[PDB]
Amino acid sequence: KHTLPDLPFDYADLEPVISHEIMQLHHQKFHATYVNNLNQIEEKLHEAVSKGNLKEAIALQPALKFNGGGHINHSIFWTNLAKDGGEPSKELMDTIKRDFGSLDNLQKRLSDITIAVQGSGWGWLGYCKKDKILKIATCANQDPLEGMVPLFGIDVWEHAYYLQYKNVRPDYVHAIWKIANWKNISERFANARQ
């Protein structure tokens, strides 16, 4: 039902920022496994909720969140990366300046909170429709970003960088900005503002 999306580029297209092997494992092993497990979990949850099997439905929650979140997060991440992703739209850049001062400031602040994640997780730039502002946040494990529309995510599970950067998470978080797909991020921003 839920399916593994093809990448919008080939496995080596993000070198030298992220290696072919990192991408191939990340897509073919991690994302594929989140999808396969999600489909199994979702079927079980459908059954449990329909039947009012309440203990079971509650028991399935951590697995739905983890595999479902895995699918949500990685699907967004692939669209967020490009060999040549361009620059923010004028509208996005103007809003970055409003809410963070400059793109430089945003990159520093998001990189810092992302680097600081204890264990596995994600950093996010998002847009909050209620307060009409850009925000930055982190999520543990595969918890999906909630409370704001996701625009740009940075995966800091060790599987996202270890083969190439080894322990040096900061160099990966800083380098990923080189392959940020600003065309996609800008499109997500435009959609979030409607």
12 binds a copy of itself (CB under 8 A): no
Instruction: Out of 5, 13, 36, 42, name the contact with a copy of itself by CB under 8 A.
Output: 42
- One-letter amino acid at 18 equals I
- Strand boundaries in the chain, DSSP class E: 121-128, 133-140, 149-155
68 binds Mn ion (CB under 5 A): no
120 binds a copy of itself (CB under 8 A): yes
- Sign of CA pseudo-dihedral 60, 66, 71, 75: positive
Binding to Mn ion in span 141-170, by CB under 5 A: 155, 157
| 75: number of Cβ within 10 Å | 17
Q: Is 71 annotated as a binding residue?
A: no
Choose among 186, 177, 10, 157: nearest CA to 105.
Answer: 177
114 binds Mn ion (CB under 5 A): no
Choose among 23, 61, 44: nearest CA to 143.
Answer: 61
Q: Which stretches of the chain bind a copy of itself, using CB under 8 A?
A: 1-2, 25, 29-30, 33, 38, 42, 45-46, 49-50, 52, 54-55, 57-59, 61-62, 64-66, 68-69, 71-72, 99, 118-121, 131, 140-142, 144, 146, 157-159, 162-163, 166-167
- Residues near Mn ion, by CB under 5 A: 155, 157
